[model samples]
Target: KSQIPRLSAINDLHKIWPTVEEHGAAIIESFLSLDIVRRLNEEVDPFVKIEPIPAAKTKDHPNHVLSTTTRLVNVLAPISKAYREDVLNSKVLHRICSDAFHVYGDYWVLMGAVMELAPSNPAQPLHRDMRFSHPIVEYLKPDAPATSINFLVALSPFTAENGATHVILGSHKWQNLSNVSMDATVRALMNPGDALLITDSTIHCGGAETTGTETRRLLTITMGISQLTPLESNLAVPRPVIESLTPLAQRLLGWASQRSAAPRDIGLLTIRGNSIEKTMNLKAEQPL
Candidate 1:
């Protein structure tokens, strides 16, 4: 019952979408070709800092349980052309997001980063991705439609020893995160390029790395409904690189401001209520 569905990268949206809604997550097998994955890894590898997250010295500290062997490289699209051109330009991933979040009218990139877990890492504290930055989702009813989705693109083979992600199947339906057991969590073992798509409500965390030699590499992009402000400022990206991406990538990074027809109040004004879309000429260029 806890098995996550796996589909081809080019699988029909109808087949993939339902599994996502029911199971809270699905694996898009071979979401990126090996060549594309290689390019992406090479593009971002230099920037990722391979270091240990020092564990809290005191047990009383709230962060004492946080894993120590993980590293992070945030905002990949801004740093890597391979990320901007190859990954965010994905049509299938975007289509699923547009449909799954139809109730919100639209969604945009919430956060994007490379989650690198060095080997011998301990398990991360089990948590809900929806509650990572804000309490907005906590206010919504459990049955309400998803306001956010996550794309975890593996750049290296994910295995139990290599710290594959651990997910609690169907946990998205649970309002309370207090009673979950580690046994309920299943490792998302995958080859390089398999993308794991999960709704915000899903319970997940990085698995421990037992093999002290191999590091687990993952590119994680989170998408939130239009009304919510993104955790990462896409506009913070450099102007030269921003101008060279596809329109879809631009819009996802909030190049275009949001406006919902039915709910007239639904909108996030560009950059502090100023119309940045008009303030600066943000143009899209075709990528190689």
Candidate 2:
């Protein structure tokens, strides 16, 4: 794994716990450097779209999605190594999961790409990230560790007025239903270099973007177990780009094809109460 400066620490988890505990979410400062953010943005621009996924069809209605570009993962290649070795490796994230979930994985990385919600976009629905908590397709089973985590870096500045993420804190603890009618008190707006660490339990959605012609851009990276495959495959990620990744990144992207220590142990897998239809290939599953 590559070394990362100013990476998130276990203690940093404690510092944000007050807010996470109070509101079910927290934000950190300058998780990624400005240079890194700039490079990442440049790498993703080619895949940008004027009208991506409509917010209404999606849960909270994310305004647009560019999916993955050949250069997206290229930028994340080193960053994921830093994320796994530095951030995911931190005791803080584990500690937070211990407080919120019953099962969790030690390692996993989801699709790496830019999530752009334009100012004209509608608000995204408040939903828990399904990286792990949701069952895999047609398997009738959930991930053994059954836990997932989402870590995001702001490529450009995020603001509540410009579609900053809105999250319902502690909603993970509310057992009545995963979907709850709640307002977002915490806005994930920070300096361009800042990042936000949100668990799968936090019910979050895109904040309204009533102003700013500049689009709100964020790099969304998730970590989970092999049991939970990625929803959007990065097959489109260029082979040459894949070949250039460090050994650690190769493993993270499943290019190494490492076998599971044990066969999946979850019960019959179903998605959103429906039976799973097909196995998901993290590398090949295309975005809708």
Candidate 3:
């Protein structure tokens, strides 16, 4: 693999857009090295828990383990710098952001969990992540765009019996968050080190492991827009640590200052141009 970020290496967004648009998602194989995976598993293994999701039914769901993963603190951690700064930065995240309906920006959060769907686990119902928010678009008719994307990096081999993820194409464009019967959607099988890049527009569900002996695992990193409601509060990190971050990271963490809106009447940039008007309209004080 090249040391540079994949975005820098592969600058063309058009190359990947067709696949993502056609399939509703795209899987990049062997995105990480085996050594990197081993190191992350070793460091995070102790934190892993085999807990129950109260939402799941016992009769239909048998897998008991779901990861409550957290972001890595030290820069040396596998995901902290290597994946976020190096890999994602190399990819066309910015172009993807511009393509999004929400249209502001995207940043990452940890979803580092091992999914253990034993043979007895039941098939999960098709669901959309949008269920967490009110699907206000259909009723309000506001052109608010999609606010997030999901990157599921496969840490282990996902086989037919290992409870692969299932996705429904074009499900996100539908205003109603309908649940599809488990029998309909297609299963996504990925190899170790592969990654599935999916947007909130796609509908997906987890499958039941039918005959696998080993636990199925995935490292899910969700990158969301600044304008959307955050999945979880990130207040746990110290204010000092927050301040210590680089300008890019600070902005990603919802820190840094925000720019002011342009005046409606004067056509703020009439004399100087949009660039100068933008600089002048910046907020007097930065956000803490």
Candidate 4:
């Protein structure tokens, strides 16, 4: 159950897109089929076991440590065919993103991964995903264009017992979170194959499983206006892996150039002021 709105994957996203402005999120049921879930999970299960999930913080901005109990399966597309093939190109998701972010003239997938919030003693710190932008986000008013958003997809049941994610409804429209408190929030309880499409400005904290065994699996796909830097540098992904993915993958992963909405600024282009595809497509000769 959720204070948030709910929809089915078969319905048009327009039916619920306004929730992003009114409530900061919506839950989409039956977002994935059980068949897809099994495949994605089987592929990811090994990686989570073999590779030690990070307990240390990285140099990324807004640097903060994580709850040791939580684990992540990073850079999802490279390893999971179910994710790269079916989930990443979700037309319903992209349509919502485009509608919510059209002011920028363009937007793309900023980040994607399977985040496992395993059993834990502590709940996560509450904050907005937009916090990564720091001072700019601090001063920016509510109701402004969303610079980023998160598609939180559930691969496992998310119950209160398993930390179904706590959020403050309508907090996205608040000028700042100074007045916010845990008392005002509600949990986003959900089922496998469900998804929460939430704006980055919303205040939320990852939940914990105190009973100590329920694993909450969420495939988080973060989308941002073309101008912002994404969390995961999908560019670092191996060439062979990237080559096999779709054009939408290339754009979302930031392999494509980040041109601004209008006749204005240019960034993220190669040294020769070309799209990143230049390195693979052009002759090697260059003036030294």
The count of residue-pair clashes in candidate 1 stands at 0
lDDT of 1: 0.78
**If both were scored by lDDT, which would come out higher, candidate 1 or candidate 3?**
1
RMSD (Cα, Å) for all candidates, in order, is 3.8, 10.0, 9.1, 4.8
- Clash count, one per candidate: 0, 20, 8, 0
TM-score of each: 0.88, 0.62, 0.63, 0.86
Cand. 3 TM to true fold:
0.63
Better of 1 and 4 by TM-score: 1
Residue-wise C-alpha lDDT for candidate 2, range 46-158, written one tens digit per residue = 55543344343543524243222111232344333343243333455445544434343224465555577655666765666663335542242432222455667677777
**Candidate 1 weakest ten by summed lDDT:** 56-65
Select the stronger candidate by TM-score from 1 and 2. Answer: 1
lDDT of 4 at 183: 77
lDDT of 1 by residue, 1-288 (tens): 457788986755667767888998889898878998888888877777542343434433233344656666667776787788877787787878777887777677888888787778777767787565678778987688888889898989999887788899898898776779888888888999898988888888888888888988888888878778787776578776777887778777888777553666545666666555666766778442
What does the lDDT come to for candidate 3?
A: 0.50
lDDT of 4 by residue, 39-82 (tens): 99988998877644354434333224566655666678778888
lDDT score, candidate 2: 0.53
Candidate 1, residue 204: how far the Cα is off, in Å: 1.5
